[PDB]
Amino acid sequence: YEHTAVMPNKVGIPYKALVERPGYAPVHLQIQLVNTRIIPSTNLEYITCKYKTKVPSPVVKCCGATQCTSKPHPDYQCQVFSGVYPFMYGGAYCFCDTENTQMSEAYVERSEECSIDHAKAYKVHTGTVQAMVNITYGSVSWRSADVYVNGETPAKIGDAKLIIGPLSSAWSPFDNKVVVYGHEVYNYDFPEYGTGKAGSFGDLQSRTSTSNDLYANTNLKLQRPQAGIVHTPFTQVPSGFERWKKDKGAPLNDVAPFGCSIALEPLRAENCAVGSIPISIDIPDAAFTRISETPTVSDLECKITECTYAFDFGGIATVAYKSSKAGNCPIHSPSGVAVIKENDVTLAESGSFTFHFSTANIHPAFKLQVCTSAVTCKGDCKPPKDHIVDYAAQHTESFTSAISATAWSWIKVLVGGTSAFIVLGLIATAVVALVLFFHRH
Amino acid sequence: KAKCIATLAPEPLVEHKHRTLILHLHPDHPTLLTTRSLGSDANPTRQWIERP
Numbered sequence: 001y002e003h004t005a006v007m008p009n010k011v012g013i014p015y016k017a018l019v020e021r022p023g024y025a026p027v028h029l030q031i032q033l034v035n036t037r038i039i040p041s042t043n044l045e046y047i048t049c050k051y052k053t054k055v056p057s058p059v060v061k062c063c064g065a066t067q068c069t070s071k072p073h074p075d076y077q078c079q080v081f082s083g084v085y086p087f088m089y090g091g092a093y094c095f096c097d098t099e100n101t102q103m104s105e106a107y108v109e110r111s112e113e114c115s116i117d118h119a120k121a122y123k124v125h126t127g128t129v130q131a132m133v134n135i136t137y138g139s140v141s142w143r144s145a146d147v148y149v150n151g152e153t154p155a156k157i158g159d160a161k162l163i164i165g166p167l168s169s170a171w172s173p174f175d176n177k178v179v180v181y182g183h184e185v186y187n188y189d190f191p192e193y194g195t196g197k198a199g200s201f202g203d204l205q206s207r208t209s210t211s212n213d214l215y216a217n218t219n220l221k222l223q224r225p226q227a228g229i230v231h232t233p234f235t236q237v238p239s240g241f242e243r244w245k246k247d248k249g250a251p252l253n254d255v256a257p258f259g260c261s262i263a264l265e266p267l268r269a270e271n272c273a274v275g276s277i278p279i280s281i282d283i284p285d286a287a288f289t290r291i292s293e294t295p296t297v298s299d300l301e302c303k304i305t306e307c308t309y310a311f312d313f314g315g316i317a318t319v320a321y322k323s324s325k326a327g328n329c330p331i332h333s334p335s336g337v338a339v340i341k342e343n344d345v346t347l348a349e350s351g352s353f354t355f356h357f358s359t360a361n362i363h364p365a366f367k368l369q370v371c372t373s374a375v376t377c378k379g380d381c382k383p384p385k386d387h388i389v390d391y392a393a394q395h396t397e398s399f400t401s402a403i404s405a406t407a408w409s410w411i412k413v414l415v416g417g418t419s420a421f422i423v424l425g426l427i428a429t430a431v432v433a434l435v436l437f438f439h440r441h
Numbered sequence: 442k443a444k445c446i447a448t449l450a451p452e453p454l455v456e457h458k459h460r461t462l463i464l465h466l467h468p469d470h471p472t473l474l475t476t477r478s479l480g481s482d483a484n485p486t487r488q489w490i491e492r493p
């Protein structure tokens with residue numbers, strides 16, 4: 001038997017319903033999401049990391065001159081400094097006083113840390129949505145499996161076939177461009193490959209951490225060696241990756257709305273409480289028992305003994321009943337006015353049972369279904385004492401949930417009196433108009 | 442890649458008021474405090490707490 005319904009996209013809050021198959025006693029169904037994962041499709045654009053400046057041994061040509069040549073090295077620099085007279089530990093290196101040239105060379109490489117300490121720039125496109133669903137029904141214990149939230153792919157969970165509809169909201173916390181560093185994700189419109197500026201995030205760009213073609217854009221400039229010293233001095237703009245690591249700002253993990261939790265393997269946003277999720281579950285035919293084979297419950301009377309509209313199961317109610325064939329009977333409240341904690345109760349030939357519920361209404365009025373029967377529960381609920389709680393609300397608050405009977409009375413008096421004032425004025429006007437007409441005629 | 446032991450700031454004192462959370466922070470070292478709403482508007486907050 002296929003049961004179709006819509007459940008809110010909430011994690012940790014179970015969805016409860018009664019599967020009513022004509023001719024069979026209701027089967028209690030409870031569906032709870034363990035986690036919801038939005039897994040977008042990503043394409044690695046390039047890898048950024050701290051650069052290393054490699055400086056080969058300078059060519060010191062004594063009593064002569066050399067010329068620099070271009071080489072296929074990132075940000076390669078070469079300059080011939082004429083008129084050098086370097087000294088070594090063993091004395092003057094060159095003989096000629098000024099007819100000597102030092103050719104300095106330098107180029108940029110990926111540092112050793114780049115294997116571990118690097119940021120991955122990704123292009124993010126719409127991917128897939130998956131969830132872990134926990135389901136129990138009737139006398140079958142809790143079973144769970146990974147399912148695809150697409151409304152097409154069915155999943156077999158404890159002999160039950162579950163089809164989870166697509167999320168009503170296509171919202172995703174990732175922009176078209178994200179930067180992944182360590183465990184943190186940043187929404188960052190990184191520069192296109194080959195466009196990174198010196199001292200900025202993209203100063204060093206590599207298509208992959210093991211590529212042999214490195215883009216480097218730093219103001220690497222060779223300076224003249226100091227008089228008499230064999231060395232290759234250079235100036236360069238400080239690594240824009242280190243700078244970025246200082247000014248990263250808040251990661252997506254700390255600013256994603258709806259409480260999304262960001263994970264990286266694979267990149268995904270977990271437990272985003274957006275929209276609702278249509279569902280369809282085919283319960284096995286063996287889980288249903290014929291009506292004549294289940295207990296008959298009658299003479300139901302529901303008394304609310306205590307109630308507070310707290311986020312927890314603050315309500316307590318006692319139901320008196322008369323029945324036959326003592327046995328288990330499911331309990332459910334079809335309306336959203338109250339959420340019942342217990343899923344089923346044991347009924348004797350006569351007596352009473354109690355159940356707990358959570359409600360946001362100051363004057364809750366809800367129907368309670370006791371298998372083949374139902375009763376109406378009414379009462380008053382006190383305000384909760386705790387200002388802050390560490391758990392999410394079980395109930396749902398409606399527009400009229402907070403309006404008390406006194407507030408309704410005042411609204412009725414307001415509208416009735418105002419309307420009566422206008423109505424009386426109009427009636428008096430009509431009466432006088434008729435009197436004037438009769439005066440003329 | 443290795444596992445490093447990072448400091449653990451002292452547990453804050455938490456006081457509750459109507460729709461308000463009051464935190465008394467007594468850090469030992471500059472400690473980052475971040476918060477966000479779980480609604481449609483994250484309204485994130487990020488500040489380094491250096492003194493009580």
Ligand SMILES: *[C@@H]1O[C@H](CO)[C@@H](O)[C@H](O)[C@H]1NC(C)=O
Nearest residue numbers: 032034132134135142143144
């Ligand atoms: C499903 O729910 C039951 C009861 O809440 C729990 O024992 C079980 O571990 C849950 N399944 C998973 C995968 O957490």
